């Protein structure tokens, strides 16, 4: 059968450089598609018959064609132009699309807002607490967050998640969860918790029953 | 001396399974019996345990009046019948015997694990302290915590909030369940007047859950 | 005023069937090509089923074939995408579309379709030494334990009589619910032609075992 | 009745002095145990009633306790004592367990040996590709194991495991998987797996069909 093959399957650029995303047929015809999907949303159009401009699309878009590569070129990459690029190939009524390629934009670094929230007193009467720590609204997204009660290095009981890169100001959120026993919980003083990025680490903390 | 346990496998929610504890080489109604349990990958917990001749019972605050630990001196076996299952007795349950100065014959351990169920969440609030220590931005959240299947949504005041929002994708944890948190930031100067509610819908379980996240003293 | 709404997806059972629902707006169904399109969470985009102009003709993604089928009823202005014998590769958002332009130019906003977990024996493949050593005389063989449920499985070795230099790794858990495993050891490659290495797996939740004779390529 | 065990985790060298330490709340009493747990395996008794050395156990565990302190001491670590260990407090028929220790043996570095496995004939009648990338008996732990498919950095398609730490030498071993479909196993060329440890990568590669 047909198959697309897409590269890069990711890249970085800043605002206004020029993007350019291939993608390479097996055997064809100019039926072929580019689509952007941006976080949790359906795929847009945005050119078909390989250079054909969907209306209403912005002219930064444009596709090309030589042989057997298909290539999306924007030419002045814009914040909101992050999402996940996909070509597509029409054959005899049979279709295949391309891994994709996510683009994500190249922006300056901003060092998070870093907030530690404390177990509710209603989750306490279950008897689990969760410990939730915020990284808002920084860049790059590698960062390294630790988790420490009474000044012991924990292990094994949180987890991570992670935003997609914000449309407007690019940059991610961050949250770390510690799960712990309300027995662990309340036989603890001090909870903190430690964003390390690059040559800074920044703890925030609170203790048990105070403020 | 030998200790063999049997019947752990896979159980429901809500449903029952009943260990069996085999003995060999000693009589156990002459011995305090125990079963101990270890989730994976942490540590020990006891759960039940029954006296000799006297067949007292003993049981760890999270399993009483669900579990129930029996002997039969006739099968020289004993017994942890386990009734209101749920996601955190998932667990290899250990059977031991103590003598002397403490649990001194252990069996191999019996696996059990508790499967998942439609489920709705918990919804805790995630609260802005009164105090700004951040310079007068304030972070305020929703956590939702132990539903399944994916996925949730989340809004906030029914959609008119929507400027500093972040809902994050959602976790899987050990447990099987899925957990996530949505937060937002604020200016401080607002949480005495402006109300916050999070809309938590899931329809896989036909749920809607509403928090109002109140600043905490 | 064009307007494309799925309904119908949720939980299925492997094995089990179910029916999503395509309602257009703002068009005539009978005169559009429609398409079913599939998405893997975290993974690209998957074309499944397409339905033709007034000819009703089918075509399909060598995935689906015999399992899935695309109708259509044009009194309903509905198009619709059959499912059956699911399987965990299923699971996915589905998106239908309308073809516009060459290409699929109105997309409604996709039905997640969740295929849980059912106890299943694992498939079990060789990971073949080479029979020319590229380690300086050390081969390095084992067994892949693949998509069972739930835990956990055990694996020896030649029944037990080959034990030093094997690592059975701990199982982990795939994206579609189920457990994968490999178990190795590594040997001398001037033993691949005289010995034999079989590995042993057993799956007592679901009541198997499988054994692999782990031959040179 | 509340244990607390300290630390929760600790390496030190063969031969080293190891220290555990367990604070009852309510304990006037000795009636504190401690038992290791190697992986898999049921806990094994080694101290009853805080100081009396169980039958059988090596001469080089003790038991003590230092006011509401109770102590663990392994007098000269070694490699078959990679264990979590545990304190244990018996009541009125009321039992309660510190939250563990582990102790992993720190021995001199040892780099791996990388074996990689391409996908069985078998595996791919079926249309999906598993790759597998073996570590064996290497230390430390921390390692970074990428792939490359016709030398593209992959992402999101790998997933590791790792062993516990081996009772003899003291050494890991880690797999890492890729899955791919059939269709894209079979269009592309070089597989290989990076691992860096240290100031030095090692790739293991291959290529399809040879
Ligand atoms: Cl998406
Ligand atoms: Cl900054
Ligand atoms: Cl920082
Ligand atoms: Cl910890
Ligand atoms: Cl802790
Ligand atoms: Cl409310
Ligand atoms: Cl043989
Ligand atoms: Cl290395
Ligand atoms: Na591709
Ligand atoms: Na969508
Ligand atoms: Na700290
Ligand atoms: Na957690
Ligand atoms: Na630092
Ligand atoms: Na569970
Ligand atoms: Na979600
Ligand atoms: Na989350
Ligand atoms: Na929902
Ligand atoms: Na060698
Ligand atoms: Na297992
Ligand atoms: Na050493
Ligand atoms: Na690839
Ligand atoms: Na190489």
């Known amino acids: 059968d047909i198959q697309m093959t897409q590269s890069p399957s990711s890249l970085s650029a800043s605002v206004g450089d020029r993007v350019t995303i291939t993608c390479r047929a097996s055997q064809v015809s100019s039926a072929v598609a580019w689509y952007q999907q941006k976080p949790g949303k359906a795929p847009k159009l945005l050119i078909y018959?390989?250079?054909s401009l969907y209306s209403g699309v912005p002219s930064r878009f444009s596709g090309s064609r030589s042989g057997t590569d298909f290539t999306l070129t924007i030419s002045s990459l814009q914040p909101e132009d992050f999402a996940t690029y996909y070509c597509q190939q029409s054959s005899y009524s049979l279709i295949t699309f391309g891994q994709g390629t996510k683009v994500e934009i190249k922006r300056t670094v901003a060092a998070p807002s870093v907030f530690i929230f404390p177990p509710s007193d209603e989750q306490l009467k279950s008897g689990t607490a969760s410990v939730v720590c915020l990284l808002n609204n920084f860049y790059p997204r590698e960062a390294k967050v630790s988790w420490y009660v009474d000044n012991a290095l924990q292990s094994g009981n949180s987890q991570e998640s992670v935003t997609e890169q914000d449309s407007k100001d690019s940059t991610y959120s961050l949250s770390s969860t510690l799960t712990l026993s309300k027995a662990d919980y309340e036989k603890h003083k001090v909870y903190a918790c430690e964003v390390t990025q690059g040559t800074t680490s920044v703890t925030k903390s609170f203790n048990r029953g105070e403020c | 001396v030998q200790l063999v346990e049997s019947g752990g496998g896979l159980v429901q929610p809500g449903g029952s399974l009943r260990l069996s504890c085999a003995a060999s080489g000693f009589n156990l109604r002459s011995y305090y019996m125990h079963w101990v349990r270890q989730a994976p990958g942490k540590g020990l917990e006891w759960?039940?345990?029954?006296?000799?001749?006297?067949?007292?019972?003993?049981?760890?605050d999270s399993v009483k009046g669900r579990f129930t630990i029996s002997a039969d001196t006739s099968k020289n076996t004993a017994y942890l019948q386990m009734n209101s299952l749920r996601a955190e007795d998932t667990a290899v349950?250990?059977?031991?015997?103590?003598?002397?100065?403490?649990?001194?014959?252990?069996?191999?351990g019996t696996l059990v694990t508790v499967f998942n169920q439609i489920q709705g969440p918990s919804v805790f609030p995630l609260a802005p302290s009164s105090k700004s220590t951040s310079g007068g931005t304030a972070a305020l959240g929703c956590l939702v915590k132990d539903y399944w299947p994916e996925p949730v949504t989340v809004s906030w005041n029914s959609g008119a909030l929507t400027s500093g929002v972040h809902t994050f994708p959602a976790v899987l944890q050990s447990s099987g369940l899925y957990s996530l948190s949505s937060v937002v930031t604020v200016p401080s100067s607002s949480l005495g007047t402006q109300t916050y509610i999070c809309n938590v819908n899931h329809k896989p379980s036909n749920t809607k859950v509403d928090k109002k996240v109140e600043p905490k003293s | 005023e064009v307007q494309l709404v799925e309904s119908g997806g949720g939980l299925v059972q492997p094995g089990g069937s179910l029916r999503l629902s395509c309602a257009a707006s703002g068009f005539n169904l009978r005169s559009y090509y429609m398409h079913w399109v599939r998405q893997a969470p975290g993974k690209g985009l998957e074309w499944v089923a397409s339905?033709?102009?007034?000819?009703?003709?089918?075509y399909y993604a060598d995935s689906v074939k015999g399992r899935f089928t695309i109708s259509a009823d044009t009194s309903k202005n509905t198009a619709y995408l059959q499912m059956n014998s699911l399987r965990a590769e299923d699971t996915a958002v589905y998106y239908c579309?309308?073809?516009?332009?060459?290409?699929?130019?109105?997309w409604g906003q996709g039905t997640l379709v969740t295929v849980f977990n059912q106890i299943q024996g694992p498939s079990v493949f060789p990971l073949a030494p080479s029979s020319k050593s590229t380690s300086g005389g050390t081969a390095a063989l084992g067994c892949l334990v693949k998509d069972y449920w739930p835990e956990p499985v055990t694996v020896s070795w030649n029944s037990g009589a080959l034990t030093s230099g094997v690592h059975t790794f701990p199982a982990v858990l795939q994206s579609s619910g189920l457990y994968s495993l490999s178990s190795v050891v590594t040997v001398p490659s001037s033993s691949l032609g005289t010995q034999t290495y079989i590995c042993n797996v057993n799956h007592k939740p679901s009541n198997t075992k499988v054994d692999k004779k782990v031959e040179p390529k | 009745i509340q244990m607390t065990q300290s630390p929760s985790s600790l390496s030190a060298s063969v031969g080293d002095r190891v220290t555990i330490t367990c604070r009852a709340s309510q304990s006037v009493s000795s009636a504190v145990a401690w038992y290791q747990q190697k992986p898999g395996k049921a806990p094994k008794l080694?101290?009853?009633?805080?100081?009396?050395?169980?039958s059988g156990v090596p001469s080089r565990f003790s038991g003590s306790r230092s006011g509401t302190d109770f102590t663990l001491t392994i007098s000269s670590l070694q490699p078959e004592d990679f264990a979590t260990y545990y304190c244990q407090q018996s009541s009125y028929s009321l039992i309660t367990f510190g939250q563990g220790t582990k102790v992993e043996i720190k021995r001199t570095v040892a780099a791996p040996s990388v074996f990689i496995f391409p996908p069985s004939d078998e595996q791919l009648k079926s249309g999906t590709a598993s790759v597998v990338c073996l570590l064996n008996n290497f230390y430390p732990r921390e390692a970074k194991v990428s792939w490359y498919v016709d030398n593209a950095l992959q992402s999101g398609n790998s997933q590791e495991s790792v062993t516990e730490q081996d009772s003899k030498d003291s050494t890991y071993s880690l797999s890492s998987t890729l899955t791919l479909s059939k269709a894209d196993y079979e269009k592309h060329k070089v597989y290989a797996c990076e691992v860096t440890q240290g100031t030095t990568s090692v790739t293991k590669s291959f290529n399809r069909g040879e």
């Open positions: 579309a309308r073809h516009g332009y060459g290409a699929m130019d109105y």
């Open positions: 339905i033709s102009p007034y000819y009703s003709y089918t």
């Open positions: 018959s390989a250079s």
